[PDB]
């Protein structure tokens, strides 16, 4: 028994909720929150900018130090950094950005990073301004992640479409 409440049951291991991931993390303070990162950990917009803004830019400061030491992530890759005021840990995961011409096949590789964590609060990878169809991202999530994932979808109209079209 954990502290996520309000999640509609999609599968055995996937629950889903209509929420902004930032406001969700502030309430639950999960062990792991997933950021929809880019390879440079440049948190300008979307979930990354919203998560980063909620940490008063401490996420960006930590991220810049990580990149200066280690170089960029791979598309499909991840790193674990601090969760700051939002979670114990932030798993920064790079899904492919369709709008930059990255290979959508790497979405499954991105979701495999979630399997290293027993429980996560996460968004649908490659969604929003990453340019992929959320219905596809949800399908890959359900077919790839085996650990317990609590998904957040910000737009009500999209959340409703995701639930109503889920097979
Ligand atoms: C101002 C606060 C705010 O925007 N919070 C949000 N929380 C969620 C779950 C969304 S999302 O539903 O759009 N998922 C989503 C997934 C991947 C990338 C992007 C992008 N860019 C978005 S946005």
Swiss-Prot record:
UniProt note on regulation of activity: Inhibited in vitro by GRL-0617.
Subcellular location: Host endoplasmic reticulum membrane
Membrane topology value: Multi-pass membrane protein
Domain Macro: 1-167
Reactions that this protein is recorded to catalyse: Thiol-dependent hydrolysis of ester, thioester, amide, peptide and isopeptide bonds formed by the C-terminal Gly of ubiquitin (a 76-residue protein attached to proteins as an intracellular targeting signal)
Subunit structure: May form homohexamers. Interacts with N protein.
Role description: Responsible for the cleavages located at the N-terminus of the replicase polyprotein. Participates together with nsp4 in the assembly of virally-induced cytoplasmic double-membrane vesicles necessary for viral replication. Antagonizes innate immune induction of type I interferon by blocking the phosphorylation, dimerization and subsequent nuclear translocation of host IRF3. Also prevents host NF-kappa-B signaling. In addition, PL-PRO possesses a deubiquitinating/deISGylating activity and processes both 'Lys-48'- and 'Lys-63'-linked polyubiquitin chains from cellular substrates.
Protein name: Papain-like protease nsp3
Gene it is expressed from: rep
Covered range of the whole protein: 1025 to 1191 of 7096
